[PDB]
Design an enzyme around this catalytic site. Structure first.
Site, PDB file in Angstrom:
ATOM      1  N   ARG A  97       0.713  -1.205   0.219  1.00  0.00           N
ATOM      2  CA  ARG A  97      -0.111   0.086  -0.037  1.00  0.00           C
ATOM      3  C   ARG A  97       0.860   1.355   0.193  1.00  0.00           C
ATOM      4  O   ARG A  97       0.464   2.132  -0.622  1.00  0.00           O
ATOM      5  CB  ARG A  97      -0.994  -0.081   1.181  1.00  0.00           C
ATOM      6  CG  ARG A  97      -1.948   1.322   1.320  1.00  0.00           C
ATOM      7  CD  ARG A  97      -2.677   1.764   0.204  1.00  0.00           C
ATOM      8  NE  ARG A  97      -3.210   3.012   0.085  1.00  0.00           N
ATOM      9  CZ  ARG A  97      -3.599   3.692  -0.966  1.00  0.00           C
ATOM     10  NH1 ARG A  97      -3.645   3.031  -2.067  1.00  0.00           N
ATOM     11  NH2 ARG A  97      -3.869   4.760  -0.900  1.00  0.00           N
ATOM     12  N   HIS A 141     -12.154   1.497   9.267  1.00  0.00           N
ATOM     13  CA  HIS A 141     -12.549   0.785   8.198  1.00  0.00           C
ATOM     14  C   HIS A 141     -11.189   0.595   7.257  1.00  0.00           C
ATOM     15  O   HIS A 141     -10.658   1.890   7.189  1.00  0.00           O
ATOM     16  CB  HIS A 141     -13.943   0.913   7.350  1.00  0.00           C
ATOM     17  CG  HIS A 141     -14.187   0.175   6.182  1.00  0.00           C
ATOM     18  ND1 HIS A 141     -13.793   0.558   5.021  1.00  0.00           N
ATOM     19  CD2 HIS A 141     -15.047  -0.931   6.363  1.00  0.00           C
ATOM     20  CE1 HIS A 141     -13.981  -0.361   4.252  1.00  0.00           C
ATOM     21  NE2 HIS A 141     -14.994  -1.354   5.020  1.00  0.00           N
ATOM     22  N   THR A 200     -11.708  -5.173   2.122  1.00  0.00           N
ATOM     23  CA  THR A 200     -11.176  -5.514   3.363  1.00  0.00           C
ATOM     24  C   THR A 200     -10.070  -6.417   3.174  1.00  0.00           C
ATOM     25  O   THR A 200      -8.918  -6.247   3.383  1.00  0.00           O
ATOM     26  CB  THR A 200     -12.118  -5.590   4.583  1.00  0.00           C
ATOM     27  OG1 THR A 200     -12.964  -4.629   4.862  1.00  0.00           O
ATOM     28  CG2 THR A 200     -11.224  -6.021   5.828  1.00  0.00           C
ATOM     29  N   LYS A 219     -33.275 -11.304  -9.072  1.00  0.00           N
ATOM     30  CA  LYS A 219     -33.537 -12.468  -9.926  1.00  0.00           C
ATOM     31  C   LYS A 219     -35.073 -12.396 -10.320  1.00  0.00           C
ATOM     32  O   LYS A 219     -35.824 -13.031  -9.840  1.00  0.00           O
ATOM     33  CB  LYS A 219     -33.247 -13.674  -9.345  1.00  0.00           C
ATOM     34  CG  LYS A 219     -31.781 -14.112  -9.446  1.00  0.00           C
ATOM     35  CD  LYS A 219     -30.961 -13.902  -8.200  1.00  0.00           C
ATOM     36  CE  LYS A 219     -31.625 -14.575  -6.826  1.00  0.00           C
ATOM     37  NZ  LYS A 219     -31.154 -14.226  -5.903  1.00  0.00           N
ATOM     38  N   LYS A 248     -22.393   0.983   1.250  1.00  0.00           N
ATOM     39  CA  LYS A 248     -23.398  -0.031   0.843  1.00  0.00           C
ATOM     40  C   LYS A 248     -24.686  -0.274   1.577  1.00  0.00           C
ATOM     41  O   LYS A 248     -24.761  -0.262   2.689  1.00  0.00           O
ATOM     42  CB  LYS A 248     -22.364  -1.443   0.892  1.00  0.00           C
ATOM     43  CG  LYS A 248     -21.395  -1.399   0.048  1.00  0.00           C
ATOM     44  CD  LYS A 248     -20.389  -2.472   0.236  1.00  0.00           C
ATOM     45  CE  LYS A 248     -20.141  -2.808   1.653  1.00  0.00           C
ATOM     46  NZ  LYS A 248     -20.475  -4.349   1.958  1.00  0.00           N
TER      47      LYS A 248
HETATM   48  N1  LIG Z   1     -15.570   1.736  -6.217  1.00  0.00           N
HETATM   49  C1  LIG Z   1     -16.262   0.825  -5.986  1.00  0.00           C
HETATM   50  N2  LIG Z   1     -17.148   0.740  -6.698  1.00  0.00           N
HETATM   51  C2  LIG Z   1     -18.185  -0.088  -6.363  1.00  0.00           C
HETATM   52  N3  LIG Z   1     -18.278  -0.980  -5.181  1.00  0.00           N
HETATM   53  C3  LIG Z   1     -17.089  -0.678  -4.611  1.00  0.00           C
HETATM   54  C4  LIG Z   1     -16.398   0.121  -4.700  1.00  0.00           C
HETATM   55  N4  LIG Z   1     -15.452   0.017  -3.553  1.00  0.00           N
HETATM   56  C5  LIG Z   1     -15.808  -0.853  -2.830  1.00  0.00           C
HETATM   57  N5  LIG Z   1     -16.857  -1.419  -3.320  1.00  0.00           N
HETATM   58  C6  LIG Z   1     -17.616  -2.546  -2.546  1.00  0.00           C
HETATM   59  O1  LIG Z   1     -17.276  -2.628  -1.143  1.00  0.00           O
HETATM   60  C7  LIG Z   1     -17.099  -4.053  -1.185  1.00  0.00           C
HETATM   61  C8  LIG Z   1     -15.793  -4.068  -0.153  1.00  0.00           C
HETATM   62  O2  LIG Z   1     -16.156  -3.326   1.090  1.00  0.00           O
HETATM   63  P1  LIG Z   1     -15.991  -4.104   2.602  1.00  0.00           P
HETATM   64  O3  LIG Z   1     -16.905  -5.351   2.551  1.00  0.00           O
HETATM   65  O4  LIG Z   1     -16.612  -3.427   3.603  1.00  0.00           O
HETATM   66  O5  LIG Z   1     -14.446  -4.632   2.928  1.00  0.00           O
HETATM   67  C9  LIG Z   1     -16.511  -4.391  -2.502  1.00  0.00           C
HETATM   68  O6  LIG Z   1     -16.667  -5.821  -2.282  1.00  0.00           O
HETATM   69  C10 LIG Z   1     -17.732  -3.714  -3.310  1.00  0.00           C
HETATM   70  O7  LIG Z   1     -18.666  -4.420  -3.206  1.00  0.00           O
END
Ligand SMILES: Nc1ncnc2c1ncn2[C@@H]1O[C@H](COP(=O)(O)O)[C@@H](O)[C@H]1O
Length: 531
Positions: free
Chosen positions: A209, A236, A334, A434, A520
């Site tokens: 990173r 996060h 993550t 679906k 999300k």
């Molecule tokens: N730039 C992005 N565009 C669309 N979805 C994203 C983006 N960045 C992260 N995500 C969503 O956030 C998830 C990861 O977040 P997390 O589960 O909290 O670790 C990814 O699997 C995607 O579903």
């Protein structure tokens, strides 16, 4: 085959642990007189020198307290300017750090800390109640330290007290030495995504990173004193790894805890912020804002987003309002430490999440056949590279289901790439609606709903149906004062999309669209509201 390979990094991965590298950079900005962290709401600054010294002093204190290499500490805090002191100190001494947020429900917190098993918890004032209750269940927690108070608070040592009580009176920060670790094996951080699992990230994940962060195409150019505005949660990976990369770059990190339209704009002006990093929810506010013009925003050269799908149309409109070429997107999980797909400097494309970062590989696989796909074909994104997690804490089963026999991690995300290798992320596989034989992405319908002048926020999920399987429904938040009917929303959507994407499952009006902390949509919450 159809594999997309990222380029070599401009700057090679340097030698040393994550802590050794962090100290190397921070030491430099410390002598310069630079400020590391500014709380935008109170205007409190922490210089690099104070932040460095408190991190070194805390490192010593934890050793004197009895923590050995591979010990565990945690944080339970909302964003505050002191957040990274425990994080950095943990990295300096080879102790794993588990960040959580104050906004966790107690159930989430008991489970999260139940997994990481911290000996000490650094809590904010606001989080103390919840951490005390967690301690009754997770009884391996010996000590609670208050992070954001200068005096002891309700009988608990504040951070300064704990350093004082655990270092000799003659100790100078400068005599401290970082611990070298086995990089590929040593767990640095235990992260939760947005019941939580413990994602183990190593020092090798982190130092990679750091290479991306300072890359002139995939990161930001080193430029000490440059102010950046962040509204993303620190616990996060979104907030963890953008922030650590900013400290490597020497930036002034301007932090805004609670969002507020006027405060947001005042801050951008008053600190002459060069860049701002946001969750997609906030774009909706900026596109409608009548206040933009009453502020000097001439210094803002970059607007970044991540965490959740971003409406290409809203993003474009916001870029247009701030007179910028586009929005800089990052995409990652993550489980992959940080963003593995990033908009390259001067290579913006509307609606793209960007391109594969240096040292990574990506492919798109057919849902049915598991076979690789060429450009412009939608499927599941899989990625491989040195930012893949070590694994889930005590969950070898879930680990095996995510990373396949060939070392590819399966994102559970649907996307595609075009002829130029730009990646577009559509939505989560588990979220597709679906409807008969169609797979309808809620993000596509969310976008349409967001372009409406009377709609402030929206969320879409499938509603069970005996005929069709699933019907697309929505929850809608109207702009204050404005007014709409279920049928008006449905008629407007119908006029813009094809037959299959119509909101057959109904519309409900709410105060707040249920969302996670990075943006999300909670599809399960919306299903229940609708039914
Ligand atoms: N730039 C992005 N565009 C669309 N979805 C994203 C983006 N960045 C992260 N995500 C969503 O956030 C998830 C990861 O977040 P997390 O589960 O909290 O670790 C990814 O699997 C995607 O579903």
């Amino acid at each position: 085959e159809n594999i997309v390979v990222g380029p070599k990094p401009f700057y090679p991965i340097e030698e040393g642990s994550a802590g050794t590298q962090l100290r190397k950079y921070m030491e430099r900005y410390a002598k310069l007189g630079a400020i590391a962290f500014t709380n935008a709401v109170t205007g409190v600054d922490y210089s690099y020198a104070e932040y460095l010294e408190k991190s070194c002093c805390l490192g010593k204190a934890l050793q004197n307290y009895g923590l050995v290499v591979d010990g565990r500490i945690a944080l339970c805090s909302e964003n505050c300017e002191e957040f990274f002191i425990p994080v950095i100190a943990g990295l300096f001494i080879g102790v794993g750090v588990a960040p959580t947020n104050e906004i966790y429900t107690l159930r989430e917190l008991v489970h999260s800390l139940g997994i990481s098993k911290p000996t000490i918890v650094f809590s904010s004032k606001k989080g103390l109640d919840k951490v005390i209750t967690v301690q009754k269940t997770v009884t391996t927690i010996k000590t609670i330290v208050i992070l954001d108070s200068k005096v002891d608070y309700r009988g608990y040592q504040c951070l300064d007290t704990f350093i004082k009580r655990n270092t000799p009176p003659g100790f100078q920060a400068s005599s401290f030495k970082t611990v070298e670790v086995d990089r590929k094996e040593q767990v640095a951080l235990i992260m939760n995504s947005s019941l939580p699992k413990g994602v183990q990230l190593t020092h090798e994940n982190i130092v990679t990173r750091f290479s991306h962060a300072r890359d002139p195409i995939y990161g930001n150019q080193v430029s000490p004193g440059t102010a950046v505005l962040t509204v993303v949660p620190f616990h996060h990976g979104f907030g963890m790894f953008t922030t650590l990369g900013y400290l490597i770059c020497g930036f002034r990190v301007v932090m805004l805890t609670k969002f507020d339209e006027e405060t947001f704009l005042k801050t951008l002006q008053d600190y002459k912020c060069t860049s701002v990093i946001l969750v997609p929810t906030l774009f909706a506010i900026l596109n409608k804002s009548e206040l933009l013009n009453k502020y000097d925003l001439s210094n803002l050269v970059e607007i970044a987003s991540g965490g959740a799908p971003l409406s290409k149309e809203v993003g474009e409109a916001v870029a247009r309002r701030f007179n910028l070429p586009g929005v800089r997107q990052g995409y990652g999980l993550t489980e992959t430490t940080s963003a593995i797909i990033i908009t390259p400097e001067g290579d913006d494309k509307p609606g793209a999440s960007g391109k594969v970062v240096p040292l990574f590989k990506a492919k798109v696989i057919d849902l049915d056949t598991k076979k690789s796909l060429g450009p412009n074909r939608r499927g599941e994104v899989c990625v491989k590279g040195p930012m893949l997690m070590k694994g889930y804490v005590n969950n070898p089963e879930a680990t095996k289901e995510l990373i396949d026999e060939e070392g590819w991690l399966h994102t559970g995300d649907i996307g595609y790439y075009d002829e130029e290798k730009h990646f577009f992320i559509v939505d989560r596989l588990k979220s597709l609606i679906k409807y008969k034989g169609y797979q309808v992405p809620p993000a596509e319908l969310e976008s349409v709903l967001l372009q409406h002048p009377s709609i402030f926020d929206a969320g879409v999920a499938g509603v069970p149906d005996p005929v069709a399987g699933e019907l697309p429904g929505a929850v809608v938040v109207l702009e204050s004062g404005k007014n709409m009917t279920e049928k008006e929303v449905m008629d407007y959507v119908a006029s813009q999309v094809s037959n299959a994407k119509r909101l057959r499952g109904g519309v409900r009006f709410v105060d707040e669209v249920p969302k996670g902390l990075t943006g999300k949509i909670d599809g399960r919450a919306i299903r229940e509201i609708l039914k």
